[PDB]
Amino acid sequence: IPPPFTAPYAPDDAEIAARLLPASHLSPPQEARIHRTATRLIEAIRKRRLGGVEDMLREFALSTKEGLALMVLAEALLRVPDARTADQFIEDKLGEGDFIHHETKSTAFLVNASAWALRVIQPGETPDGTIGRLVKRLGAPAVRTATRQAMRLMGNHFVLGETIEQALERGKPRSGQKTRYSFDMLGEGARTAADARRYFDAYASAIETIGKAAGNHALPDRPGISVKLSALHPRFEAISRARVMVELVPQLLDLAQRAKAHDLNFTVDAEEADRLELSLDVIAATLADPSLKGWDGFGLAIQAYQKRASAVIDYVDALARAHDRKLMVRLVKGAYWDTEIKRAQERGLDGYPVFTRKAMTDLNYVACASKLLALRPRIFPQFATHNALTVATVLEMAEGSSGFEFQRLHGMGEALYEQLAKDHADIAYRTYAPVGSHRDLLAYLVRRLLENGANSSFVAQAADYRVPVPALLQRPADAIVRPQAAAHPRIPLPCDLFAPERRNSRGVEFGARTALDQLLTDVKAEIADATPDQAHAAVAAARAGFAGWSRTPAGIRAAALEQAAHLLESRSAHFIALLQREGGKTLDDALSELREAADFCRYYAAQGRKLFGSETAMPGPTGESNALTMRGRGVFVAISPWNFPLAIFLGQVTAALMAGNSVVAKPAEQTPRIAREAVALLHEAGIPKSALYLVTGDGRIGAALTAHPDIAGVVFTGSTEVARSINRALAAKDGPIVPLIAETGGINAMIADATALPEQVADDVVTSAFRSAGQRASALRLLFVQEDVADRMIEMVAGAARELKIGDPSDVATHVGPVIDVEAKQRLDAHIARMKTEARLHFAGPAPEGCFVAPHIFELTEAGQLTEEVFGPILHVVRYRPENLERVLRAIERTGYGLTLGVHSRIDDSIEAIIDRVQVGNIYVNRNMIGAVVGVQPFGGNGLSGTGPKAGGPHYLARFATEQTVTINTAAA
């Protein structure tokens, strides 16, 4: 038995290309046969009458969003009982008006079949929505034609139903016949326990349907089924490995046994790169069961676009050797390329787990295919591709043998593989059809549309007559030529995302067991109050250090911040441990705050050089110079919260310091130890002792600091009430009117309409409301959801919220740590008890013994029932009618807050109408509302949410400074 798979996550592309490039060399007569095969295949592709997705996209010059909208509308129209009824609709209503209504209803239909029944259309309606913009661009008649073509595609290439039973009934062959295709089951990412059971039953149900229609031939000439591990477990993630191995393995085994009893091909699909190791763990434990001996149909997909692909092949082979099994192994290039790039950047990884040049994937795919062909007969390879060149090359390397197959998706590669079958009679290819229910269509269509709409896609190019046939025949090695060119030149490494402005902080990929274990190990390996006199002395000492710090050159202040960033990341294990023990933060939140703290230092340093590093020359008359500068104001008092006790503490403090002010810093009572370490670190990084003082204690000590007549400003993050009293104590003084910078939370809403993917809304609602136990100023408090999808969305949020593990934040599996202290928990439980008597309850999770509040979900009759920011894991939901979006926006305006706002919608015109109407500081569209990144999402809002300027943005530092104009009459010279 091989040890648990653990290859390097993102090794260097050049070293890989240095081996693959010389080894790709094929002999001249080999390459000529490849050229001819692929030419004949492409000529058949260009024969041209069954259309495809890519054909529809190209014909009407549709974006992927527009393709999606029409295919969803098409699916809804196909399920209207009377075809003549759908035709009347297409002619008389579609494109005439009600554009957003048609897009909303047809999408709601996928989760709520009763949502749509076929109002009346007034003429002259402004064409908005995805459909309306399509009508303005192409004209209503072309939209009707494109919709009719989408209906043919949806009916011919998908096997769908309102439930899996209906899909399987529709995809059933005539009694006594074998199915002419294998089942690529729709379904991914269970969000709820019921989801995981439902997909399990769909798979078991599908295995019986194809089992009964399987023929009398032996493998490989029998139908197959494809399943996703993420569909079978609601927290399929590396940090939940322990429950995954206990719960998922028996499930996958049960389905594998049912597959074996019909002698089927049973294939585990390959998903995102951070699930690779977990999937192999689950697959290894499942294959190990002796009940699966004597059956040759078990297998998995392997993604060639991963640098680890070749090692996965070795691992799978040693598995088959160790258990004396035969496996069927599918080689694909990979369906998640864009996701892997984005994820690596967001996560600050030291590289990409995938190649970044298409030819490198194509090169690695052929190398992996050659490796798999040599592992026959123990490995039966399945080459799933619609690339005529890839097919031609793989066929040549097999040298005319058997013991393998090609694979395609229904609606793609048909002309390719028919021609291959004509020219080489012994070639087998497996055709999969997508099979599933409407509630799984949207998520699937999104991914399918990305590959078909891609410019680099082979099937898209081989069908565009503008692309000459010889262009599609360039061999991958000839496009790369040299190893140093393996990486794509226009995609920086995550560490270079902000170059040359500044460096980026490093993150950790939790789906790489070596990385997660090293971090867990490092972290495991790791104050009297101030009298009013000592706080008074602190101001006086900061006041005395101001002059020298103010006149220290900006580049030296900036160097100190950059060295502070260096020390934070070098000592990340220490601060993470402090964030877990003192802050109560889970490991993902602690790492993220540590990164944010370093990001604040480097960002304010770079801004600091631009702003205070040199003077701005003003135009003016000759004989006279005019120069504008900015300089420190004096002593800033910085008051910081307990919920970001390191990053907001350091953002506020280093901003004031960078602008040339000395600082007296008063941390939250609950988290002084992290603040002491941070202050000590800034001193060590070069902040003079006289420029920065820490004063710990109560709100009376915070009041004494902000009431002190010698301070030049206050930077404060906390509650509205305390900011007002600070503001009043400042206004009460007879001295100068000094700046107050305040961020004071929000009652943050999210608006989700029926065009949004309900499983993405659910993910983002669960994250935004319950991550960090809701102890974030940015957290989602109030979800507005359109009534046609409200039931499904609320139930999915509740089921997902139920799978959150609440407990000790040091345990790797914890999703929800404790709230900060007993007093906070008491405030939250009081609001929970009040909401139970006042509003509908949807979920009240079980809290472990101790200082914990569990996720809660309440539904309100009106938004007005929620009158306070409640700083915990407590979501409130209002369902609304689409014609009442104005009442939603008025409710959001009525709270007086304006920090974050989430918008989930496919419809650009709706998104824009919301953005135009609200004043909220941070609007997040089709993603969660939390974790603003320094210099990426400048963070902060208005109204009762605070004053600005936004932290982590280009207007922040100036507010800590005052301007100076120097005008010199130079005429004497």
Ligand X SMILES: Cc1cc2c(cc1C)N(C[C@H](O)[C@H](O)[C@H](O)COP(=O)(O)OP(=O)(O)OC[C@H]1O[C@@H](n3cnc4c(N)ncnc43)[C@H](O)[C@@H]1O)c1[nH]c(=O)[nH]c(=O)c1N2
Please identify which residue in 303, 592, 706, 748 interacts with ligand X, judged by CB under 6 A. Answer: 303
State residue 548 phi and psi, 5-degree precision. Answer: -70, -40
357 part of the interface to ligand X, by CB under 6 A: yes
Pair 950, 938: CB distance under 8 Å: yes
129 part of the interface to ligand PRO, by CB under 6 A: no
Side-chain-side CA neighbours of 328 within 13 Å: the count stands at 29
Which of the ranges 105-113, 401-409, 433-441, 898-906 carries the binding residues for ligand X, by CB under 6 A?
A: 401-409
Least CB distance to ligand X at residue 19 (A): 17
Please identify which residue in 416, 932, 934, 944 interacts with ligand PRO, judged by CB under 6 A. Answer: 932
**How far apart are the two ends of the chain, measured CA to CA in Å?**
87
948 part of the interface to ligand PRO, by CB under 6 A: yes
Which of the ranges 194-202, 383-391, 619-627, 957-965 carries the binding residues for ligand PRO, by CB under 6 A?
A: 957-965
Site for a second copy in 34-93 (CB under 8 A): 63-65
Q: Which of ligand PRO, ligand X, a second copy, none lies near 65, with the C-beta cut-off 5 to 8 A by kind?
A: a second copy
Least CB distance to ligand PRO at residue 772 (A): 8
132 part of the interface to a second copy, by CB under 8 A: no
610 part of the interface to a second copy, by CB under 8 A: no
Using DSSP, state whether 216 is helix, strand or coil. Answer: coil
Q: Which helix (H) or strand (E) holds 72?
A: helix 64-78
Binding mask 358-397 for ligand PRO (x = CB under 6 A): ----------------------------------------
234 part of the interface to a second copy, by CB under 8 A: no
Closer to ligand X by Cβ: residue 431 or 717: 431
Site for ligand X in 438-457 (CB under 6 A): 451, 456-457
Q: Which of ligand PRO, a second copy, ligand X, none lies near 409, with the C-beta cut-off 5 to 8 A by kind?
A: ligand X
Q: Which helix (H) or strand (E) holds 331?
A: strand 327-332
Please identify which residue in 930, 935, 941, 945 interacts with ligand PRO, judged by CB under 6 A. Answer: 930
Chain breaks in the chain (C to N over 2.5 A) after: 48, 118, 526
913 part of the interface to a second copy, by CB under 8 A: no
Site for ligand X in 482-521 (CB under 6 A): 488
- DSSP states along 341-403: HHHHHHTT-SS-SB-SSHHHHHHHHHHHHHHHHHTTTTEEEEEE---HHHHHHHHHHHTT--S
Pair 273, 305: CB distance under 8 Å: no
Site for ligand X in 232-291 (CB under 6 A): 269-270
Q: Which of ligand X, ligand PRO, a second copy, none lies near 337, with the C-beta cut-off 5 to 8 A by kind?
A: ligand X
Total binding residues for a second copy by CB under 8 A?
A: 67
Closer to ligand X by Cβ: residue 451 or 593: 451
Cα 827 to chain centroid, rounded: 33
Q: Which of ligand X, ligand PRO, a second copy, none lies near 776, with the C-beta cut-off 5 to 8 A by kind?
A: ligand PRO
Q: Distance (Å, rounded) from C-alpha 91 to C-alpha 736?
A: 71
Closer to ligand X by Cβ: residue 472 or 911: 472
Site for ligand PRO in 867-906 (CB under 6 A): 871
Specify burial of residue 193 (Cβ count, 10 A radius: 0-12, 13-18, 19+): middle
739 part of the interface to ligand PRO, by CB under 6 A: yes
955 part of the interface to a second copy, by CB under 8 A: yes
- Residue 218 tokens read as 């032996």
374 part of the interface to a second copy, by CB under 8 A: no
- DSSP states along 408-441: EETTSSHHHHHHHHHH-TT--EEEEEEEEEGGGH
Which of the ranges 12-20, 220-228, 569-577, 954-962 carries the binding residues for ligand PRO, by CB under 6 A?
A: 954-962
State residue 748 phi and psi, 5-degree precision. Answer: -85, 130
Please identify which residue in 222, 228, 235, 262 interacts with ligand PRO, judged by CB under 6 A. Answer: 235
Q: Distance (Å, rounded) from C-alpha 775 to C-alpha 769?
A: 9
- Residue 429 tokens read as 């290819």
Cβ neighbours of residue 727 closer than 8 Å, sequence gap 6 or more: 740, 742
Least CB distance to a second copy at residue 12 (A): 26
Please identify which residue in 220, 494, 641, 645 interacts with ligand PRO, judged by CB under 6 A. Answer: 641
Cβ neighbours of residue 551 closer than 8 Å, sequence gap 6 or more: none
Distances (CA, A) of 825 to 721, 841, 853: 19, 19, 7
Which of the ranges 93-101, 316-324, 385-393, 417-425 carries the binding residues for ligand X, by CB under 6 A?
A: 385-393
Least CB distance to a second copy at residue 731 (A): 12
710 part of the interface to a second copy, by CB under 8 A: no
Please identify which residue in 306, 361, 563, 607 interacts with ligand X, judged by CB under 6 A. Answer: 361
- DSSP states along 539-569: HHHHHHHHHHHHHS-HHHHHHHHHHHHHHHH
Q: Distance (Å, rounded) from C-alpha 426 to C-alpha 428?
A: 7
Cα 445 to chain centroid, rounded: 17
Q: Which of a second copy, ligand X, ligand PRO, none lies near 390, with the C-beta cut-off 5 to 8 A by kind?
A: ligand X
Q: Which of ligand X, a second copy, ligand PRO, none lies near 132, with the C-beta cut-off 5 to 8 A by kind?
A: none
426 part of the interface to a second copy, by CB under 8 A: no
Q: Which helix (H) or strand (E) holds 194?
A: helix 193-212
Least CB distance to a second copy at residue 573 (A): 31
| DSSP for residue 227 | E
Site for ligand PRO in 747-806 (CB under 6 A): 776-778
Q: Which helix (H) or strand (E) holds 39?
A: helix 28-45
Question: Which pairing describes strands 840-844 and 856-859: parallel, antiparallel, or unpaired?
Answer: antiparallel
Closer to ligand PRO by Cβ: residue 784 or 939: 939
Maximum Cα interatomic distance, the chain, rounded to a whole number of Å: 107
Binding mask 623-662 for a second copy (x = CB under 8 A): -x-x-x--x-x-----------------------------
Site for ligand X in 565-594 (CB under 6 A): none
Cβ neighbours of residue 246 closer than 8 Å, sequence gap 6 or more: none
Q: Which residue has the tokens 């069954």?
A: 50
Please identify which residue in 347, 933, 957, 960 interacts with a second copy, judged by CB under 8 A. Answer: 933
Pair 613, 555: CB distance under 8 Å: yes
Binding mask 542-571 for a second copy (x = CB under 8 A): ---------x--------------------
State residue 546 phi and psi, 5-degree precision. Answer: -60, -50
| DSSP for residue 612 | H
Q: Distance (Å, rounded) from C-alpha 579 to C-alpha 674?
A: 7
Which of the ranges 297-305, 552-560, 617-625, 939-947 carries the binding residues for ligand X, by CB under 6 A?
A: 297-305
Q: Which of ligand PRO, a second copy, ligand X, none lies near 930, with the C-beta cut-off 5 to 8 A by kind?
A: ligand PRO
Pair 923, 589: CB distance under 8 Å: no
State residue 88 phi and psi, 5-degree precision. Answer: -60, -40
- Residues of the shown chain interacting with ligand X in the complex, contacts defined by CB under 6 A: 269-270, 301, 303, 305, 332-337, 354-358, 360-361, 384-387, 390, 407-409, 432, 451, 456-458, 488
- Name the site residues for ligand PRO (rule: CB under 6 A): 235-237, 630, 641, 643, 718-719, 739, 745, 776-778, 871, 930-932, 939, 948-949, 955, 958-959, 961-963
Binding footprint of a second copy on the chain (CB under 8 A): 63-65, 338-339, 342, 446, 551, 616, 618-621, 624, 626, 628, 631, 633, 735-737, 739, 906, 911, 915-916, 919-927, 932-933, 935-944, 946-950, 953-955, 958, 962-969, 971-973
